[PDB]
């Protein structure tokens, strides 16, 4: 069996990492929960066992076979390289290593083969990217993809526990105390790293992450760059708009694509149905389509509203929904670890390829 | 002045029509409030003066100069032709007449000229179409429009006062009683006129109105058809995805366009700023962009996140926000009535 560590065990993703591990096919001999100094000494369950939480440090990874990181990019930057040096295989949820050419960026249903060449770190893509890749890969395999335009409808749990509690508080102030939305005080959203903060209650915020130089956000640009790496095709054009809405869990996405060859609409639907990890939920005659509230708690990615563009011959619109803390994060990560186990890839790396900070 | 009638004065839109008329430059001598058989008798205000709500009948429109209809297709299909008969000029908020080739479909800042050809009835377009037209007309004027792709983020107030209440009750049950969103009971959304109902609380519902043969909803097809008619150009390719989200008032839209000639972004921003009814709010260095919660109560349409596509030479993305009961409905209507007055078309 393995020694498995969860870095960021106390966070929103971490909680789901624990659940996914509890329900895993991974043979686990020993579990370790890591967080900041603040949580160290506190206790948390793994199934029935009480596990004492430890401080994450340069020296915390001795004896660990697999570490799952979900404690922000800065934490992965500081400590993941030390875990690799110690002989750990790291599965990282953060953005920090995703564009490093020595790091596979993996959704197992799409590009599991890229795991073969890892050097101790495997990166999980951004939550919004993962579910879009699950929906579109089966289409790409058969008809190709020329371009993608996507508008996202993103739940607040992606920004962490703080963001969840802030959203709950704001809704309660409005609905129970009669505070007007524009009078609400916010501290976290749209981005903890940015200067100004805005209410999410009864709002739609077209900012996720900070702005980059080209006036897209980092979240938008992550979708673009991650898509091309995962699909191994820099020729695919991708432009995104990423919007936070008042949803606690499950991202939805309005996705437009143009295929390389015309894709018969009903075959597109069949291909998506046949693809592992994707569930076709598309029957408009009976008002059947993916919804955020029904996706919460499932590892599947749900696709519907599938239809031709009204004018573009190769154009197709769809609606994609998935639990952003499961396939979007914790489940993708644990699925990666299971795949590494199944293919004999859980072993220390020969050469260190990551700078110690 | 004029005798003005508000049909459906008790509803979500009706209540705003009253506010807009109260604040209007339209010279009003008498105001009449019309609704259904079971509102008939109560009293609504016009400024500080009581108005008896009257039932809407075939004969209740005699003596009326201008009638503002906001009470669903049903009410407008039956009673508006009788109002035109009685010499009334009708401004219709509903979808019923919108594609009638004898009925102008008007956003005043865009195609006011179309009011000249009217024959008793003016159609106000759909809320989500109007704000899109205000934002895009200035770009079309200067560089053309080849195609539009839009994904909307629509507030619940567009589906009626009943939808607003269902939303607030649903949210309270989740946050106060701990009910799981997927277990909530729903009566209205996504569509009051469709077979099944779903919760909106902590949800996003990809259905506005009912479905058509081509698997787009009627809301989506209205955006497509009304755009062509308002801009008087059938060659503009338009496809929409319309989504309800847990917002009470103000629609937002993620809008993608391709122009006919390349349009420099700074010139695009300047053209929208210059266009009447559009306000530029776009300064990402200070996280300035349009937001539903700030747009509530304003007649303006707000545009930002304006940026070029990363690959398409003529492609442009933007974010457009406006109060759906104001510019999206009541203010557009009252603006039409004011325009008719000013251009001497109320006869
Ligand atoms: N310097 C750090 N070292 C290790 N873990 C950290 C550090 N800073 C934050 N974390 C962890 O990242 C996660 C953040 O989750 P979320 O964003 O959902 O709150 C938490 O588990 C948090 O632990 P802690 O709870 O000890 O602060
Ligand atoms: N058959 C009808 N004749 C006239 N008005 C109607 C009829 N049915 C509904 N209405 C009005 O349409 C509006 C709908 O409002 P909303 O869409 O916000 O629920 C209300 O003012 C309602 O008035 P009433 O209050 O009498 O039902
Ligand atoms: O570290 C963060 O602050 C963070 C927070 C939410 C999402 C992400 C991510 O890129 O998926 C990230 C990130 O890894 O950059
Ligand atoms: Na499948
Ligand atoms: Na065209
Ligand atoms: Na302007």
> Mind giving me the DSSP string for A88-116?
PEEEE-SSTTTT-TTS-B--HHHHGGGGG
> What distances in angstroms separate CA A297 from CA A166, A294, A340, one per listed residue?
22, 8, 24
Query: What is the distance between the alpha carbons of residues B99 and B125, in angstroms, rounded to a whole number?
Result: 10
Closest CA to B55 of B4, B86, B93, B9: B9
Q: What are the φ and ψ backbone dihedral angles of A333, each rounded to 5 degrees?
A: -60, -50
Contacts of B135 (CB under 8 A, 6+ apart): B255, B272, B278, B301, B303, B318, B320
Tell me if residue B133 falls in helix, strand or coil. helix
Q: Does residue B313 belong to the interface with chain A, where contact is any CB pair within 8 Å?
A: no
Whether residue B219 contacts residue B266, with contact meaning beta carbons closer than 8 Å, is answered with no
**Among B131, B145, B151, B191, the residue to mutate for chain A (most A Cβ within 10 A):** B151
CATH 3.40.50.720 domain locations along chain A = 1-124+325-357
CATH 3.40.50.720 domain locations along chain B = 1-124+325-343
CATH of domain A1-124+325-357: 3.40.50.720
Contacts of A332 (CB under 8 A, 6+ apart): A107, A108, A124, A125, A130
Q: What is the dihedral of CA B219, B221, B226, B227, to 10 degrees?
A: 110
Instruction: Name the B residues in 283-312 with CB < 8 Å from any A CB.
Output: 284-287, 289-294, 296, 304-305, 307, 309-312
Bridging pattern class, strands A89-92 and A66-69: parallel
Burial pattern B37-46, b for ≥16 Cβ within 10 A else e, equals eebbeeebeb
- CATH number among 3.40.50.1000, 3.40.50.720, 3.30.465.10, 3.30.420.40, domain B1-124+325-343: 3.40.50.720
Give the neighbor-by-neighbor strand order of the sheet with B237-244: B237-244, B147-154, B251-258, B315-322, B301-308, B278-280
3-state SS record for A210-251? CECCCCCEHHHHHHHHHHHHHCCCCCCEEEEEEEECCCCCCE
Bridging pattern class, strands A147-154 and A278-280: unpaired
Strands, DSSP E only, in B232-336? 237-244, 251-258, 278-280, 301-308, 315-322
Count CB atoms within 10 A of the CB of residue A193.
11
Bridging pattern class, strands A251-258 and A315-322: antiparallel
Closest CA to B154 of B221, B59, B253: B253
Q: Which helix (H) or strand (E) holds A301?
A: strand A301-308
Bridging pattern class, strands B315-322 and B301-308: antiparallel
Concatenate the DSSP letters of all residues of B37-48 into one string.
Answer: TTTTT-EEESSS
Bridging pattern class, strands A28-35 and A49-55: parallel
The DSSP call for residue B117 is: G
Helix axes B218-230, B127-143, angle to 10 degrees: 40
> What distances in angstroms separate CA B241 from CA A254, A285, B206, B255, one per listed residue?
7, 17, 7, 11
Tell me if residue B193 falls in helix, strand or coil. coil
Cβ-nearest to B292 among A203, A237, A249: A203
| Sign of the C-alpha dihedral computed for residues B11, B13, B19 and B22 taken in this order | negative
Tell me if residue B173 falls in helix, strand or coil. helix
- Nearest residue in chain B measured CA to CA from A183: B293
Query: What is the distance between the alpha carbons of residues B96 and B7, in angstroms, rounded to a whole number?
Result: 15
Cβ separation A245–B245 shorter than 8 A: yes
Q: Find tokens 């007449």 and name the residue.
A: B97
Closest CA to B19 of B346, B342, B334, B338: B334
Q: Which helix (H) or strand (E) holds B337?
A: helix B331-342
Burial pattern B306-318, b for ≥16 Cβ within 10 A else e, equals bbbbbeeebbbbb
The DSSP bridge partners found for residue B241 are B151
The DSSP bridge partners found for residue A68 are A6, A91
Distance of CA A331 to the CA centre of its chain: 9
| Sign of the C-alpha dihedral computed for residues B25, B27, B30 and B36 taken in this order | negative
Closest CA to A215 of B269, B151, B300: B269
Q: Find tokens 């309270």 and name the residue.
A: B172
Bridging pattern class, strands A315-322 and A89-92: unpaired
Q: What are the φ and ψ backbone dihedral angles of A246, each rounded to 5 degrees?
A: -80, 70
Pull the structure tokens for residue B172: 């309270």
> What distances in angstroms separate CA A337 from CA A4, A20, A345, B147, one per listed residue?
10, 11, 9, 45
Query: What is the distance between the alpha carbons of residues B260 and B265, in angstroms, rounded to a whole number?
Result: 14
CATH of domain B125-324: 3.30.360.10
A242 among known catalytic residues: no
The counts of H helices and E strands in chain B are: 9, 14
Q: Which helix (H) or strand (E) holds A133?
A: helix A127-143
Strands, DSSP E only, in chain B? 2-7, 28-35, 43-45, 50-52, 54-55, 66-69, 89-92, 121-123, 147-154, 237-244, 251-258, 278-280, 301-308, 315-322
Instruction: Name the A residues in 190-209 with CB < 8 Å from any B CB.
Output: 190, 194-196, 198-199, 202-207
Contacts of B196 (CB under 8 A, 6+ apart): A286, A287
CATH 3.30.360.10 domain locations along chain A = 125-324
Query: What is the distance between the alpha carbons of residues B168 and B51, in angstroms, rounded to a whole number?
Result: 30
> What distances in angstroms separate CA B155 from CA A163, B205, B328, B345, one per listed residue?
22, 11, 11, 34
Concatenate the DSSP letters of all residues of A31-63 into one string.
Answer: EEEEE-TTTTT-EEEETTEEEEEEE--TTTTTT
Q: What angle do CA A101, A106, A112 make, to 5 degrees?
A: 110
Instruction: Name the A residues in 103-162 with CB < 8 Å from any B CB.
Output: 147, 149, 151, 153
* Cα separation of the two ends of chain A: 31
Pull the structure tokens for residue A185: 């005080």
Greatest CA separation found in chain B? Answer: 61
Cβ separation B196–A290 shorter than 8 A: no
Concatenate the DSSP letters of all residues of A9-36 into one string.
Answer: TTSHHHHHHHHHHHT--S-EEEEEEEE-
Rg, chain A, Cα only: 20
Task: Say how many CA atoms lie within 13 Å of A337 toward its Cβ.
Answer: 32
Greatest CA separation found in chain A? Answer: 61
Closest CA to A168 of A152, A184, A154: A184
Q: Name the residue with the closest Cα to ligand 1, atom 8.
A: A36
Q: Which helix (H) or strand (E) holds B79?
A: helix B72-85
Whether residue A331 contacts residue A89, with contact meaning beta carbons closer than 8 Å, is answered with no
Give the neighbor-by-neighbor strand order of the sheet with A147-154: A237-244, A147-154, A251-258, A315-322, A301-308, A278-280
Whether residue B135 contacts residue B145, with contact meaning beta carbons closer than 8 Å, is answered with no
| Sign of the C-alpha dihedral computed for residues B259, B265, B270 and B273 taken in this order | positive
Rg, chain B, Cα only: 20
Whether residue B262 contacts residue B313, with contact meaning beta carbons closer than 8 Å, is answered with yes
Tell me how far the alpha carbon of residue B134 lies from the centroid of ligand 6, in angstroms: 9
Query: What is the distance between the alpha carbons of residues B247 and B254, in angstroms, rounded to a whole number?
Result: 16
């Amino acid at each position: 069996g393995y020694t498995v560590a969860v870095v960021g065990a106390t966070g929103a993703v971490g909680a789901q990492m624990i659940k996914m591990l509890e329900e895993s096919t991974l043979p686990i001999d020993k579990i370790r929960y890591l967080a900041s100094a603040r949580s160290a000494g506190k206790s948390l369950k793994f199934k029935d066992q009480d596990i004492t939480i430890e401080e994450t440090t340069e020296t915390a990874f001795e004896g660990v076979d697999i570490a799952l990181f979900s404690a922000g990019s800065s934490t992965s930057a500081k400590y993941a390289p030390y875990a690799v040096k110690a002989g750990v295989v790291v599965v990282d949820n953060t953005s920090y290593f995703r564009q490093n050419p020595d790091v596979p960026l993996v959704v197992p249903e799409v590009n599991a083969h890229a795991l073969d060449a890892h050097n101790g770190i495997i990166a999980c893509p951004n939550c919004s990217t993962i579910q879009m890749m699950v929906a579109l890969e089966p289409v790409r395999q058969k008809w190709g993809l020329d371009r993608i335009i996507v508008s996202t409808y993103q739940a607040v749990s992606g920004a962490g526990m703080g963001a969840i509690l802030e959203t709950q508080r704001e809704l309660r102030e409005v609905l129970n105390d009669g505070v007007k939305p524009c009078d609400l005080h916010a501290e976290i959203l749209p981005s903890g790293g940015d200067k100004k903060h805005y209410p999410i209650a009864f709002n739609a915020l077209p900012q996720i992450d900070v702005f980059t130089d080209n006036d897209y956000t980092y979240e938008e640009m992550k979708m673009t760059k991650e898509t091309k790496k995962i699909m191994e095709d820099d020729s695919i054009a991708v432009s995104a708009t990423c919007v936070r809405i008042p949803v606690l869990s499950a991202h939805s996405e309005s996705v437009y694509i143009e295929t390389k060859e015309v894709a018969p609409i009903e075959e597109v639907k069949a291909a998506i149905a046949a693809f592992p990890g994707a569930v076709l939920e598309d029957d408009v005659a009976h008002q059947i389509y993916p919804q955020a509230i029904n996706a919460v708690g499932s590892r599947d990615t749900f696709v519907g509203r599938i239809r031709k563009d009204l004018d573009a011959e190769k154009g197709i619109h769809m609606w994609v929904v998935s639990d952003n803390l499961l396939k979007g994060a914790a489940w993708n990560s644990v699925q990666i670890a299971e795949t590494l186990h199944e293919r004999g890839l859980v072993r220390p790396t020969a050469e260190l390829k990551f700078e110690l900070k």
